[PDB]
């Protein structure tokens, strides 16, 4: 891209892979800073499954209230 | 020689250089390369 | 050596006699024709079109550094590998320069 | 030791397994009743790789069969060698997915997968030393491409250090049998790259082309395509079950054929293949095997391998032969084709020799090459996907089960990024 | 463990149900008494010892047809109290069968439906048959669909409606109730298949060479189409298709689910065996505009998706080689946003012949279900017919006096205008 | 993998087609029912099991002859719906069969031609038979040739037309439509063979010794000529000839392709065996002017090229020794610009005999197709006959009132004048 | 080592090869099943010259068969020794050329030749040390004379240093079987002189003359002409497959028989040839062989060798005999005929001895002489060509496929220049 590639190019050939990995990772907070979602720093159905699991758990918790 | 002529054919230059002209060019270059090596 | 003789011979005949030009013009015309056929064959031409694409990975950075090195003759770079002196040749039509 | 378990899903995967296990049983001399009747001592030394032992001396495959509908497993049981499979491993639902990826991955596939994961965990925890898993499924179907890929992630989350194989059939645009193939192909490729350690693409179009041109048989059927795929599948793990000059397990191939962790999509091919009428004309020699092995029409994919450059290649020779000839032929096939081999990695062909040939053949070769020419398949799949998605056609079926268009956009973007970064190394020079 | 329930309402519905139920009993070897002298389970149920009971219910307000059924050779087959019959006919009045006399009968039908559904464990969906241009048929079909859509919810329902011909008509008031019933089933049925009589008359005349056909000849062809559609659920096949795997492949958008069918080959025994009936020629005949089962011209519109079923000894490679030829032709063009539009199914069981019928015995057959943009013409012509008489409010007093409101006619017109606008909006390229 | 399609139009065409189709069925061992109790593929097609179907189509507007065909012994052979029949005859009016009633029938014939052509894979070309001196024959032949020349293009078409005799005639108006049809096929047919009835009557009278011949005797000789021409495609021979190898050997210029045929030997069993039938004597008899199959004198003109077929046990050296003798004779002279003019073909299969026929069984036969300059006489005499009645505009009202323009007669006259001038220009020495 | 591959094209070339390979197999004791059953050790030492080795111990010729129509190769397969040919080497088209040189060299022959060139390249790249190629084809046909000669140029362009043989049958004006023979003969001779290293003309007329006069058999057939040509073909390479006093490969003959690069058109002859009834009278001695060898009627061409002077001559004796007698007889045949030998090159006869005679004969001789008398054949061919071309007869067939008259003019001029410069040395004196 830019500014982060010129900074990675100032680091010796032995650590350049690690610096490139750090620069990709530093690309990591920046997007969050640029945007605002704490879940972009690595690598119907979802919602429904989560909802169902929570509901069952809630019922168990309700049973705990019942206890 | 035939591999170099295949280069001439593949680049559509065979209309400008005949097989006999190609052999003559290769011969002249061979002569001067051999004189330079010696 | 064969490519130089080949370029000199092909462009020494009608209809395209270039003997009035430097031998480099005949050789350049062979490379321009090779570029045209390479482009026609529907095959990549990036190595012909971008002469500064000599080095892996950092081609755009080198292009920007070359522009800065040319815009002002010795632009100081914070992090550049090495300055190499190259020669460019232009032909100018000037009477007794 | 170092054995693997078999897991298959969907109708296509079940039909592939129904021939793969027949081929394995015929290779090891196991009758359809589970009783050994082989001739050679070596047929029993490493039988623990694929078969378990039960009381009464019979053998049972460690295979797990899953589908969202009961018909295919109710049909495979009545076929030959169908009694070997343990009835307990059969898990199925009562509804099906209807070629809808969302139903087979979010609503129906999520609730059922606990039972199959239970038996998967039972099989893996018990075995002596795990080598890994191999998966057969199709990307053109809903239940398969959904449940199989979610199971891939679930298995990877619990066994991060083991190796994972996937033999995936991708929908070709030539022979199309389902209109919603691009959607569940694109959605599946997104998840498959993140978790599978190895992936091997297979196309029905290439199988028909091979059957029509090389074998020259008049009427191909699914049994012939399954037989070719089964022979190719068996060829990979042959040296892990038999002695040889240079043994090479799956992990050794993983080390030598994957340069970067995201480039693990191979295309394969099997040699020799000859017609019935010409099987007497030909003479089996190493040059004859290697000339057919690198033949473009012999690949199990429609991708044209002379449209790109090989990053690396592998060959698994079978039978007793001299190693000097193999090495010199590998060198010759690499000197005469220097234009199609990437130049910044020298000596990019791996070879292995196994002294036990297939039953009925004196020499055989299995070829696994990682090439840049595979980009064309993802290009056409994404082209069809973006042609159909721009009008939101058939989108309501997927969006009615909790899925949204954002997951489609992310999948398309990640697939295009994969396509781009796979060809990035094609133009790379030293 | 897979079941389906068929609903027959009205005279045309009962007369086509009889036609399909000779064919199913003949195809599964069951005698007319119901006694055999595991594939039956899709349509039938075992009583424990002996006879089989169809999973079908017959509805009508006019008792003549049911009384004819209860005295024919099939008197012993059907359960005595699932042939629900009324006393007074609706007499082609839609408002009667939706507001006056159908309400008192619908409860018994729903009780029978529940009693049949509790027996099934793997219920795939419902089938319904009704001639649209009649009072009781359209009205009771609308009411039953509306009750089922809320009693069961997401279960799939398929409607084999018979719309009136472009110019040939038996009644004089059938456009009114046809439009109202289309309004009712537009938002309530998952699949609707076009079945007007004129096209099938032309098919019989041209191919079967019958110059004086009756309704039985039409109903036998419809029964053959139904059998071809549902063969994949009860016979082994190389490429299976389920009912639930339709809205993911033929229905681009929830509103658009009206499609027209075709069948091939149709030929008599006197000249059938003189020609080879290859797969290529039958799949060419199936796409001929003159062989459409509904009187619509496919050359006037684009295709959206084609789902087409084979049965017999057909090989997949021959199917692909014929799909390619059709894609080649310049007279058949698909919509821009659909690169591949074919879903292919292959089954092994050849079609069965009914003794004394018209069709001969053949080893290969093809049935196509195709969704095309050209279907809007029938809606436009029905709308034009409706407007002519609704301008002067003719025949309206026969409907207002049966409890229906004055404004109910207008909103059906608005929904048809919306449907016609939607069909135009979808068919434009991007 | 080599095929040919024969077209029969008009009463004479159908009656000669019947004659050739007994002979082919007899020669390939096929019973009249179509059942045998790999050479058949040129004329027939296999239906998969049992019967064979001819690659022929019968056309006529007048139904009597087709109805006679559909009730004879050959009712089971031909496909029922390739015997296209009309209702109203053209009644010797050319304008009728080209402008009024032939247009509504030609579409069905073209559809049948397409359906037959899609089956063939190695289509060599078309054959067509039509008696020229009739309305429907000439008109429909012209229209079919004109449609085929643009639908298919470069495929070769051969025409076995029967021109009227010099003085013997059955109609009174046949010169008009003969001239018009010659106009039509001059620029549209690759080969035209002369077949007038008077010459064949003289042949029968002199050789067969029949004093009361009927049309069947003529048609059997024509069928034998056709079989001799097409034998080389379906039987092994020392010197083969294909249909496409004609315009390169017999047609010096695109305009000149009318040639006249001859056959030898023609002899009855009562006196055939008393003489040895050497190759020299049969090849001498074939060149006799009295044995021409068209009533033209070859002594009145030069030869351009001679293509002549042998079949039986003939040896090439004996053929050469006889070609030399013919070159020696002073009564036969070739054109100056043609040093060698003979094309020779040799086949091994002897001619087959039809039971109850005229010709006997022999081991050697010769059929010649010769292009000569003397053919201009028939054109000149037909032109003279045409001019006599066209001077007073007789019978023209029967043509103007059927849609044809007044000037259409003149341009055919101009084209005949051009052809006659061309024949004179070619025959002069340099 | 130093082996050659066989390539044949056209019907005539295929029929020549069908006997050449039979003769070779009978010489080496190979059964028609590919199994060796010979008697002598020498029969297997140099079998790699013509035969390849496959698994199972059987042998397969390295022959390539090409034609534009499938009939001839479908017929040669059913003949004796037809199973030896590898089915993969059979390449054919579906259209044919029809004796038209343009079609077989520009339009149809250009697209097909890639497949045959692929197998040609496969055969040549593999072999131990290439000696060269030998070509059999006819100049009287279109597809042969076109595709073979274009293949000659394509092979020469890729292997400029190897040797090339062509056995060419030119159309004689005496026995003419095709009217368009001069055109494709003249066009082919133009290309043949530029690329072929050796050419050997053979005439059917001379073969008939030999069969009628020397063997005195009553009924010659193509089998006898083929047998004579096959014996002559085998005689040339005998010493390359067997030991002898003075071995002489094809290149050694090329050095010694071609004085200037454009004079490489030889005429050959085989001795001894005796009738069945006189085979007991004659005694086989070197004088008896050499007197028949130089006999004018014994030449395989109608050209009269005492109408010109030999530039050089060659003889390949077979059997065990004294060399002193051979040399003295060669000297005597050159002293008694000094008028017919050119005087500025002394000692212009080459001799070679091979100790292995043909099966059934004790002595045999093959004669290859380069003489100035061959001019007469080109003279008459050009005479017929210019007699036919001046009127532009049959020119449109050639000009309709992209060819023009300029290539005809250049071909005629080059052929006349060859004729002139070949006789230029006849009148040359020292
Ligand atoms: N294809 C087909 N259509 C039929 C048949 N019988 C009736 N129809 C059609 O049904 C339409 C009228 O509806 P019907 O089914 O006859 O009568 P209904 O549906 O019971 O309605 P009611 O008149 O109130 O009894 C007519 O326009 C016919 O076209 C039949 O046997 N086959
Ligand atoms: N050689 C031969 N010629 C025939 C035969 N039948 C009719 N002709 C000729 O055909 C000419 C008239 O044309 P037809 O074939 O009889 O009738 P058509 O071609 O069907 O034309 P229409 O009169 O309109 O029906 C006559 O002059 C006859 O010479 C036949 O069986 N053999
Ligand atoms: N090789 C092979 N492929 C098959 C077979 N049956 C189906 N297929 C392929 O699988 C695809 C359809 O997959 P599908 O059955 O819907 O998978 P599912 O949804 O998991 O059941 C088709 O495109 C076929 O090409 C078979 O028996 N053998
Ligand atoms: N010696 C020999 N000559 C043949 C044979 N068959 C045909 N010919 C010659 O080949 C010539 C015709 O060549 P043709 O078959 O048209 O060659 P093509 O066009 O390549 O198929 C004739 O003049 C014959 O003399 C054969 O079996 N033996
Ligand atoms: Mg009713
Ligand atoms: Mg008539």
Q: Cβ contacts of residue G42 below 8 Å, gap of 6+?
A: G242, G243, G356
Choose the catalytic residue: F146, F198, F245, F408.
F245
Gyration radius (Cα) of chain E, Å: 21
Using CA atoms, how far apart are residues F296 and F382, in angstroms rounded to an integer? 13
Assigned token pair, B10:
């593949």
Q: Cβ contacts of residue F210 below 8 Å, gap of 6+?
A: F204, F217, F358
Q: CA angle, G394 as apex, G391 and G400 as ends, to 5°?
A: 120
D194 vs A contacts (CB less than 8 Å): 43
Closest by CA to E97, choosing from E149, E148, E60, is E60
Atom of ligand 2 nearest to the CA of F216: 31
CA of E61 to the centre of ligand 5 (A): 7
Write out the residues surrounding ion ligand 5, Cβ under 5 A.
E 11, 62
CA distances from F373 to F258, F290, F298, F305 (A): 10, 17, 8, 10
CA of G144 to the centre of ligand 4 (A): 10
Are residues G215 and G343 both part of a single domain? no
Q: Cβ contacts of residue E6 below 8 Å, gap of 6+?
A: E17, E20, E43, E55, E56, E57, E126, E127, E128, E129
Q: CA angle, D126 as apex, D120 and D130 as ends, to 5°?
A: 80
| G181-195 vs G405-424: helix crossing angle, rounded to 10 | 60
Assigned token pair, E268:
């008599």
Is residue G168 lining ligand 4, measured as CB closer than 6 Å?
no
Are residues D8 and D84 both part of a single domain? yes
Is residue E239 lining ligand 3, measured as CB closer than 6 Å?
yes
Using CA atoms, how far apart are residues C67 and E291, in angstroms rounded to an integer? 70
Are residues D245 and D277 both part of a single domain? no
C-beta separation of G303 from G381 below 8 A: no
Q: How many helices and strands (H and E) does chain A possess? A: 3, 0
Atom of ligand 4 nearest to the CA of G171: 23
| F279-286 vs F316-328: helix crossing angle, rounded to 10 | 40
Q: Which of F3, F153, F248, F342 to mutate to test the interface with G (most CBs of G within 10 A)?
A: F248
Of G53, G56, G88, the CB nearest to D280: G56
The dihedral through the CA atoms of G208, G214, G218, G222 has a sign that is negative
Is residue D212 lining ligand 3, measured as CB closer than 6 Å?
no
Q: Phi first, then psi: what are they for F234, rounded to 5°?
A: -130, 15
Indicate whether G411 belongs to any domain: no
Q: Does G44 touch chain D (CB under 8 A)?
A: no
A7: helix, coil or strand? helix
Q: Phi first, then psi: what are they for D352, rounded to 5°?
A: -150, 150
Find the DSSP H helices in chain B. 2-10, 19-37
Asked whether the bond before C88 is cis by omega within 30 degrees of 0, the reply is no
Contact C79 A5 (CB under 8 A): no
Are residues D70 and D34 both part of a single domain? yes
CA distances from C14 to B8, B23, C10, C26, F285 (A): 19, 21, 9, 13, 65
Q: How many CB pairs under 8 A join D and E?
A: 115
C-beta separation of C7 from C29 below 8 A: yes
Indicate whether G421 belongs to any domain: no
Using CA atoms, how far apart are residues G206 and E202, in angstroms rounded to an integer? 72
CA G16 to chain centre: 10
CA E407 to chain centre: 30
Using CA atoms, how far apart are residues A15 and D178, in angstroms rounded to an integer? 50
Contact C79 A10 (CB under 8 A): yes
Using CA atoms, how far apart are residues G386 and G182, in angstroms rounded to an integer? 9
Using CA atoms, how far apart are residues F137 and F159, in angstroms rounded to an integer? 12
Q: Residue for token digits 């054929």? A: D257
Indicate whether D275 belongs to any domain: yes
> Could you tell me whether strands F56-60 and F3-9 are parallel, antiparallel, or unpaired per DSSP bridges?
parallel
Q: Phi first, then psi: what are they for F363, rounded to 5°?
A: -95, -15
A5 vs C contacts (CB less than 8 Å): 58, 61
E275 vs F contacts (CB less than 8 Å): 47, 53, 79
Atom of ligand 1 nearest to the CA of E215: 31
Residue nearest to atom 1 of ligand 1 (CA): E197
Using CA atoms, how far apart are residues A52 and A50, in angstroms rounded to an integer? 5
Are residues G99 and G224 both part of a single domain? yes
CA C71 to chain A, closest CA, distance in angstroms equals 20
Are residues G294 and G173 both part of a single domain? no
C-beta separation of G171 from G183 below 8 A: no
F430: helix, coil or strand? coil
Which secondary-structure segment (H or E) carries F323?
A: helix F316-328
Are residues D239 and D366 both part of a single domain? no
Range of the domain at D65: 3-256
Contact D430 C46 (CB under 8 A): no
Atom of ligand 4 nearest to the CA of G15: 27
The dihedral through the CA atoms of D125, D127, D130, D133 has a sign that is negative
Tally of domains in chain D: 2
Indicate whether G429 belongs to any domain: no
CA A45 to chain D, closest CA, distance in angstroms equals 4
Using CA atoms, how far apart are residues E162 and E174, in angstroms rounded to an integer? 12
C-beta separation of D373 from D307 below 8 A: yes
Using CA atoms, how far apart are residues G89 and D213, in angstroms rounded to an integer? 14
Is residue F17 lining ligand 2, measured as CB closer than 6 Å?
no
Q: Facing residues of F342 across strands?
A: F306
3-state secondary structure chain G: CCEEEEEEEHHHHHHHHHHHHHHHHHHHCECCCCCECCCCCHHHHCHHHCEEECCCCCEEECEEEEECCCHHHHHHCCCCCCCCCCHHHEEECCCCCCCCHHHHHHHHHHHHHHHHHHHHHHHHHHCCCEEEEEEEEECCCHHHHHHHHHHHHHHHHHCCCCEEEEEEECCCCCCCCCCCHHHHHHHHHHHHHHHCCEEEEECHHHHHHHHHHHHCCCCCCHHHHHHHHHHHHHHHCHHHHCCCCCCCCHHHHHHHHCCCCCCCEEEEEEECCCCCCCCCCCCCCHHHHHHHHCCHHHCCCCCCHHHCCEEEEEEEEECCCCHHHHHHHHHHHHHCCHHHECCCCCCCEEEEEECCCCCCCCCEEEEEEEEHHHHHHHHHHHHHHHHHHCCCCCHHHHHCCCCCHHHHHHHHHHHHHHHHHHHHCCCCCC
Using CA atoms, how far apart are residues F306 and F304, in angstroms rounded to an integer? 7
Which secondary-structure segment (H or E) carries A62?
A: helix A45-66
Indicate whether D318 belongs to any domain: yes
**DSSP 8-class letter at F163:** P
Choose the catalytic residue: E22, E104, E211, E245.
E245
D94: helix, coil or strand? coil
Closest by CA to D329, choosing from D271, D379, D276, is D271
Indicate whether D28 belongs to any domain: yes
Using CA atoms, how far apart are residues D316 and D289, in angstroms rounded to an integer? 11
Using CA atoms, how far apart are residues F374 and D289, in angstroms rounded to an integer? 68
Q: Could you tell me the CATH number of the domain that includes residue G297?
A: 3.30.1330.20
Of D275, D277, D281, the CB nearest to G60: D281
User: Which chains are within 8 Å of E by 3+ CB pairs?
Assistant: D, F
Q: Could you tell me the CATH number of the domain that includes residue G181?
A: 3.40.50.1440
Find the DSSP H helices in D100-221. 101-102, 108-126, 142-143, 149-158, 181-195, 204-210
Q: Phi first, then psi: what are they for E49, rounded to 5°?
A: -155, 105
Pick the last residue of a domain from D211, D234, D256. D256
Assigned token pair, G341:
């030998």
| E408-426 vs E376-390: helix crossing angle, rounded to 10 | 150
Q: Cβ contacts of residue E154 below 8 Å, gap of 6+?
A: none
Q: Residue for token digits 């919306």? A: E418
Are residues D287 and D308 both part of a single domain? yes
Residues within 8 A of F (CB atoms), E 255-274 only: 270-271, 273-274
Pick the last residue of a domain from G233, G256, G279. G256
Indicate whether D410 belongs to any domain: no
Is residue F15 lining ligand 2, measured as CB closer than 6 Å?
yes
Which secondary-structure segment (H or E) carries F217?
A: helix F215-230
Closest by CA to D294, choosing from D319, D274, D267, is D267
Strands of the E156-162 sheet, one edge to the other = E83-85, E56-60, E3-9, E123-131, E156-162, E191-194, E258-264, E364-372, E303-312, E342-347
CA distances from F79 to E272, F7, F75 (A): 9, 14, 9
Closest by CA to F26, choosing from F93, F96, F74, F75, is F74
Of E306, E317, E344, the CB nearest to D220: E317
Closest by CA to E424, choosing from E383, E385, E377, E369, is E377
Pick the last residue of a domain from D256, D273, D307. D256
Closest by CA to F351, choosing from F204, F223, F197, F206, is F223
Are residues G122 and G178 both part of a single domain? yes
Is residue F241 lining ligand 2, measured as CB closer than 6 Å?
no
3-state secondary structure chain E: CCEEEEEEEHHHHHHHHHHHHHHHHHHCCCCCCCCCCCCHHHCEEECCCCCEEECEEEEECCCHHHHHHCCCHHHHCCCCCCEEECCCCCCCCCCHHHHHCCHHHHHHHHHHHHHHHCCCCCEEEEEEEEECCCHHHHHHHHHHHHHHHHHCCCCEEEEEEECCCCCCCCCCCHHHHHHHHHHHHHCCCCEEEECCHHHHHHHHHHHHCCCCCCHHHHHHHHHHHHHHHHHHHCCCCCECCCCCCCCCCCCCCCCCCEEEEEEECCCCHHHHCCCCCCHHHHHHHHCCHHHECCCCCHHHCCEEEEEEEEEECCCHHHHHHHHHHHHHCCCCCECCCCCCCEEEEEECCCCCCCCCCCCCCCCEEEEEEEEEHHHHHHHHHHHHHHHHHHCCCCCCHHHHCCCCCCCHHHHHHHHHHHHHHHHHHHCCCC
Q: Phi first, then psi: what are they for A56, rounded to 5°?
A: -65, -40
Q: CA angle, F155 as apex, F151 and F158 as ends, to 5°?
A: 110
C35: helix, coil or strand? helix
Burial class (CB in 10 A: 0-12, 13-18, 19+), G12: buried
Q: State this model's resolution in angstroms.
A: 3.7
Assigned token pair, D280:
């007497």
Answer yes or no: E211 catalytic.
Answer: no
Asked whether F and C share 3 or more beta-carbon pairs under 8 angstroms, the answer is no
Concatenate the DSSP letters of all residues of D385-410 into one string: HHHHHTTTTTHHHHHTTT--HHHHHH
> Could you tell me whether strands F364-372 and F258-264 are parallel, antiparallel, or unpaired per DSSP bridges?
antiparallel
Asked whether E and D share 3 or more beta-carbon pairs under 8 angstroms, the answer is yes
Indicate whether D418 belongs to any domain: no
Using CA atoms, how far apart are residues E143 and E146, in angstroms rounded to an integer? 5
Of D94, D177, D205, the CB nearest to E239: D177
Using CA atoms, how far apart are residues F385 and F383, in angstroms rounded to an integer? 5
Burial class (CB in 10 A: 0-12, 13-18, 19+), C43: exposed
**Residue F105 CB neighbours (<10 A):** 20
Which secondary-structure segment (H or E) carries D268?
A: strand D265-271
Contact D393 E252 (CB under 8 A): yes
G13 vs F contacts (CB less than 8 Å): none
Using CA atoms, how far apart are residues F37 and F34, in angstroms rounded to an integer? 9
CA E285 to chain centre: 21
Are residues D362 and D303 both part of a single domain? yes
Q: CA angle, F72 as apex, F66 and F78 as ends, to 5°?
A: 65
Are residues G215 and G305 both part of a single domain? no
Domains of chain E: 3-258 (3.40.50.1440), 259-377 (3.30.1330.20)
Gyration radius (Cα) of chain B, Å: 11
A9 vs C contacts (CB less than 8 Å): 58, 61, 79
Residue nearest to atom 16 of ligand 4 (CA): G141
C-beta separation of E100 from E87 below 8 A: no
Q: Cβ contacts of residue E112 below 8 Å, gap of 6+?
A: E57, E81, E82, E84
Q: Cβ contacts of residue F16 below 8 Å, gap of 6+?
A: F8, F129, F160, F219, F222, F223
- Chain length of chain E: 430
**Residue F26 CB neighbours (<10 A):** 16
- Chain length of chain A: 67
Are residues D252 and D305 both part of a single domain? no
Q: Which of C42, C51, C56, C58 to mutate to test the interface with D (most CBs of D within 10 A)?
A: C56
**DSSP 8-class letter at F208:** I
Which secondary-structure segment (H or E) carries D270?
A: strand D265-271
Using CA atoms, how far apart are residues G44 and G59, in angstroms rounded to an integer? 11
Tell me the CB-side half-sphere exposure of residue G415, using CA atoms within 13 A.
29
Is residue F360 lining ligand 4, measured as CB closer than 6 Å?
no
Using CA atoms, how far apart are residues D238 and D253, in angstroms rounded to an integer? 13
Q: How far apart are the first and last CA of chain C?
A: 34
| F103-117 vs F135-151: helix crossing angle, rounded to 10 | 50
Closest by CA to F159, choosing from F181, F139, F129, F183, is F129
Q: By what technique were these coordinates determined?
A: cryo-EM
Is residue E215 lining ligand 1, measured as CB closer than 6 Å?
yes
Which secondary-structure segment (H or E) carries F65?
A: helix F64-69
Contact G86 D284 (CB under 8 A): no
Q: Cβ contacts of residue G395 below 8 Å, gap of 6+?
A: G389, G405
Using CA atoms, how far apart are residues F257 and F372, in angstroms rounded to an integer? 10
C-beta separation of F84 from F33 below 8 A: no
Using CA atoms, how far apart are residues E369 and E251, in angstroms rounded to an integer? 11
**DSSP 8-class letter at D306:** G
Closest by CA to D311, choosing from D350, D369, D367, D269, is D369
G33 vs D contacts (CB less than 8 Å): none
Q: Facing residues of E129 across strands?
A: E8, E160
């Amino acid at each position: 891209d830019l500014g982060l590639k010129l900074a990675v190019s100032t680091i010796g050939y032995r650590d350049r892979y690690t610096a490139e990995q750090c620069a990709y990772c530093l690309d990591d907070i920046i997007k969050s800073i640029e945007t605002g979602d704490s879940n972009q720093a690595f690598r119907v159905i979802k919602e429904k499954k989560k909802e169902e699991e929570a509901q069952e758990e809630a019922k168990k918790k309700y049973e705990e209230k019942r206890l | 020689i035939p591999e170099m002529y295949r280069f001439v054919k593949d680049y559509e230059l065979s209309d400008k250089l005949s097989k006999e002209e190609h052999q003559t060019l290769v011969r002249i270059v061979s002569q001067e390369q051999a004189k330079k090596k010696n | 050596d064969y490519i130089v003789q080949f370029a000199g011979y092909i462009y020494s005949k009608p209809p395209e006699d270039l003997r009035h030009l430097p031998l480099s013009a005949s050789l350049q015309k062979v490379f321009d024709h090779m570029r045209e056929i390479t482009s026609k064959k529907g095959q990549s031409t990036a190595l012909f079109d971008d002469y500064d694409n000599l080095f892996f990975g950092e081609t755009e950075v080198i292009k920007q550094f070359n522009k800065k090195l040319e815009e002002n003759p010795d632009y100081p770079l914070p992090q550049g590998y090495k300055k190499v002196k190259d020669r460019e040749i232009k032909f100018e039509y000037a009477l007794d320069p | 030791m170092r054995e693997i378990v078999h897991i298959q899903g969907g109708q296509c995967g079940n039909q592939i397994g129904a021939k793969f296990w027949e081929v394995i049983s015929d290779e090891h001399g196991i009758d359809p009743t589970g009783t050994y009747h082989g001739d050679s001592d070596l047929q029993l030394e490493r039988i623990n790789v694929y078969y378990n032992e039960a009381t009464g001396g019979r053998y049972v495959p460690r295979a797990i069969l899953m589908d969202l509908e009961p018909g295919t497993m109710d049909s495979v049981r009545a076929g030959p060698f169908g009694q070997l499979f343990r009835p307990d491993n059969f898990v199925f639902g009562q509804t099906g997915a209807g070629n809808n990826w969302a139903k087979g991955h979010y609503t129906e596939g999520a609730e059922l997968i606990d039972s199959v994961l239970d038996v998967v965990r039972k099989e893996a925890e018990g075995c002596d030393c795990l080598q890994g898993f191999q998966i057969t499924h199709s990307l053109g179907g809903g239940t398969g491409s959904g449940m199989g890929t979610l199971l891939i992630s679930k298995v990877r989350e619990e066994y991060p250090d083991r190796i994972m194989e996937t033999f995936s059939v991708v929908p070709s645009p030539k022979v199309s049998d389902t209109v919603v193939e691009p959607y569940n192909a694109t959605l599946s490729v997104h998840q498959l790259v993140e978790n599978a350690d190895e992936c091997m693409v297979i196309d029905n179009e290439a199988l028909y082309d091979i059957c029509f041109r090389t074998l020259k048989l008049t009427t191909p059927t699914y049994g012939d395509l399954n037989h070719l795929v089964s022979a190719a599948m068996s060829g990979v793990t042959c040296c892990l079950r038999f002695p040889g000059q240079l043994n090479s397990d799956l992990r050794k191939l993983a080390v030598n054929l994957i340069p970067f962790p995201r480039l693990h999509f191979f295309m394969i091919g099997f040699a020799p293949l000859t017609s019935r009428g010409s099987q007497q004309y030909r003479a089996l020699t190493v040059p004859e095997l290697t000339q057919q092995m690198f033949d473009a029409k012999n690949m199990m994919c429609a991708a044209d391998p002379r449209h790109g450059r090989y990053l690396t290649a592998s060959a698994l020779f079978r039978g007793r032969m001299s190693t000097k000839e193999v090495d010199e032929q590998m060198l010759n096939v690499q000197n005469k084709n220097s234009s199609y081999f990437v130049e910044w990695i020298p000596n990019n062909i791996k070879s292995s020799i196994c002294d036990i040939p297939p039953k009925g053949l004196k020499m055989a070769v299995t070829f696994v090459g990682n090439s840049t020419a595979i980009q064309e398949m993802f290009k056409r799949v994404a082209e069809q996907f973006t042609a159909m998605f721009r009008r939101k056609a058939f989108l309501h079926w997927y969006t009615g089960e909790g899925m949204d268009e954002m997951e489609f956009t992310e999948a398309e973007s990640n697939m295009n990024d994969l396509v781009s970064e796979y060809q990035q190394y094609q133009d790379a020079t030293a | 463990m897979r079941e389906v329930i068929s609903i027959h309402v009205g005279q045309g519905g009962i007369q086509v149900g009889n036609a399909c139920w000779e064919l199913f009993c003949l195809e599964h070897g069951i005698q007319p008494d119901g006694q055999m002298p595991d594939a039956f389970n899709t349509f039938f149920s075992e009583t424990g010892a002996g006879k089989h009971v169809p999973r079908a219910v017959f509805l009508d307000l006019e008792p003549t047809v049911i009384d004819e059924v209860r005295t024919g050779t099939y008197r012993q087959l059907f359960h005595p109290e699932q042939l629900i019959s009324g006393k007074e006919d609706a007499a082609n009045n839609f408002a009667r069968g939706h507001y006056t006399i159908g309400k008192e009968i619908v409860d018994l039908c729903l009780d029978r439906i529940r009693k049949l559904a509790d027996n099934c464990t793997g219920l795939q969906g419902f089938l319904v048959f009704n001639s649209v241009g009649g009072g009781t048929g359209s009205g009771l079909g609308s009411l039953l669909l509306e009750r089922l859509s809320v009693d069961y919810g997401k279960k799939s329902k398929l409607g084999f409606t018979i719309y009136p011909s472009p110019q040939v008509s038996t009644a004089v008031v059938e456009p009114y109730n046809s439009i109202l019933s289309t309004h009712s089933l537009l938002e309530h049925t998952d699949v609707a298949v076009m079945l007007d009589n004129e096209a099938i008359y032309d098919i019989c005349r041209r191919n079967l060479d019958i110059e004086r056909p009756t309704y039985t000849n039409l109903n036998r062809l419809i029964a053959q189409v139904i059998s071809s559609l549902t063969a994949s659920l009860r016979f082994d096949g190389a490429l299976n298709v389920d009912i639930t795997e339709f809205q993911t492949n033929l229905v681009p958008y929830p509103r658009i689910h009206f499609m027209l069918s075709s069948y091939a080959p149709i030929i008599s025994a006197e000249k059938a065996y003189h020609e080879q009936l290859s797969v290529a020629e039958i799949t060419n005949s199936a796409f001929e505009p003159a062989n459409m089962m509904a009187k619509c011209d496919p050359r006037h519109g684009k295709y959206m998706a084609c789902s087409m079923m084979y049965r017999g000894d057909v090989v997949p490679k021959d199917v692909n080689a014929s799909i390619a030829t059709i894609k080649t032709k310049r007279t058949i063009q698909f919509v821009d946003w659909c690169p591949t539009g074919f879903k292919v199914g292959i089954n092994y069981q050849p079609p069965t012949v009914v003794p004394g019928g018209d069709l001969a015995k053949v080893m290969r057959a093809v049935c196509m279900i195709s969704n095309s943009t050209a279907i809007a013409e029938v809606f436009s012509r029905l709308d034009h017919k409706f407007d002519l008489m609704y301008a002067k409010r003719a025949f309206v007093h026969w409907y207002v006096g049966e409890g229906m409101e004055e404004g109910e006619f207008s909103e059906a017109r608005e929904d048809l205008a919306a449907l016609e606008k939607d069909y135009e909006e979808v068919g434009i390229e991007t």
